[PDB]
Write a protein that binds this ligand. Structure first.
Ligand SMILES: [Mg+2]
Ligand SMILES: [Mg+2]
Ligand SMILES: [Mg+2]
Ligand SMILES: [Mg+2]
Ligand SMILES: [Mg+2]
Ligand SMILES: [Mg+2]
Ligand SMILES: [Mg+2]
Ligand SMILES: [Mg+2]
Ligand SMILES: [Mg+2]
Ligand SMILES: [Mg+2]
Length: 225
RNA sequence: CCGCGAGGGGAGCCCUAGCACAGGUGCUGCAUGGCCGUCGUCAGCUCGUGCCGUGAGGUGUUGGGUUAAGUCCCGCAACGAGCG
């Protein structure tokens, strides 16, 4: 399982953004501009996807956990399902602090582990029917935001983010903690902040869908089966 | 209590003299405790960690909707917690 220059075209991976939004630093990853939009050099994308996948692989081979990040409405369900098949992910909201204030965030994990505990329990039917609903609500939100974070029992060995310029909170945090950043990066982004880059469309389903799967494909390849 | 007894000593209480002292709704609420009136049963006041800033400090608590309500919802560098 590697990836064809062809398959990448079909994904529409090389379709960049308009020329308006644009990070000149990113120029080193561009073929040319057709009708307003920069077209990402796939001959490059491919040779970076290699250096990058080679990292992902050995990291996985050594047991590392990779935190997947996508807030964008396009990604969400792709990040989710892809992660699961076996890492943690963030796909609802990036709660500022999740990495650098990891402790007091994971505190919120034990809260829902403990509210999960309380709803399987008899002791719930005790509380007045008002706290009862107001406690189911507390639990509910926690599951929303944390259903993927709750797998992290310590900081990731690397984070893999979809769209670094959307996420550069998440990114900032990683770099401050010396965790390697991997990203699917479009032309709007500072590639200098990305330790392990994949330049290509950070926008279309058909694009992310391809990348994330082949990543994950590679992961459980090099986890023994 | 001592004595066979006359009786001496002693506890308690009393009076007189003298000494510690008691008594004072005399001052200072601008030396205070306690308690109370008040803004105000108004929805506010803050803290841990993270984050922003050289810094005082900010963030959170703000914004949009909702509520008797910092009541809840969505949002968001914030996630919570304490007094309310
Ligand atoms: Mg973008
Ligand atoms: Mg006798
Ligand atoms: Mg006698
Ligand atoms: Mg006196
Ligand atoms: Mg006074
Ligand atoms: Mg007076
Ligand atoms: Mg500082
Ligand atoms: Mg306030
Ligand atoms: Mg009230
Ligand atoms: Mg409250």
């Amino acid at each position: 399982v590697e990836i064809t220059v062809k398959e990448l075209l079909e994904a529409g991976v090389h379709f960049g953004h308009e020329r308006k939004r644009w990070n000149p630093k990113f120029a080193r990853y561009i073929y040319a501009e057709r009708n307003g939009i920069h077209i990402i050099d796939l001959q490059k994308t491919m040779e970076e996807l290699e250096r990058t996948f080679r990292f992902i692989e050995d990291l996985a081979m050594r047991g590392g956990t990779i935190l997947f990040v996508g807030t964008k409405k396009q990604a969400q369900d792709i990040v989710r399902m892809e992660a699961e098949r076996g890492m943690p992910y963030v796909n609802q909201r990036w709660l500022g602090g999740m990495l650098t204030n990891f402790k007091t965030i994971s505190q919120r994990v034990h809260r829902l582990e403990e509210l999960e505990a309380l709803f399987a329990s008899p002791e719930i039917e005790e509380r007045p029917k008002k706290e009862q609903v107001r406690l189911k609500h507390e639990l509910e939100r926690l599951q929303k935001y944390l259903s993927g974070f709750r797998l992290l029992k310590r900081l990731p060995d690397a984070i893999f983010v979809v769209d670094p310029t959307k996420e550069a909170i998440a990114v900032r945090e990683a770099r401050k903690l010396f965790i390697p950043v991997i990203a699917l990066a479009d032309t709007d982004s500072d590639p200098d902040l990305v330790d392990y880059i994949i330049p290509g469309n950070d926008d279309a389903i058909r694009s992310i869908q391809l990348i994330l799967s082949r990543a994950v494909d590679l992961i459980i390849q090099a986890r023994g089966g």
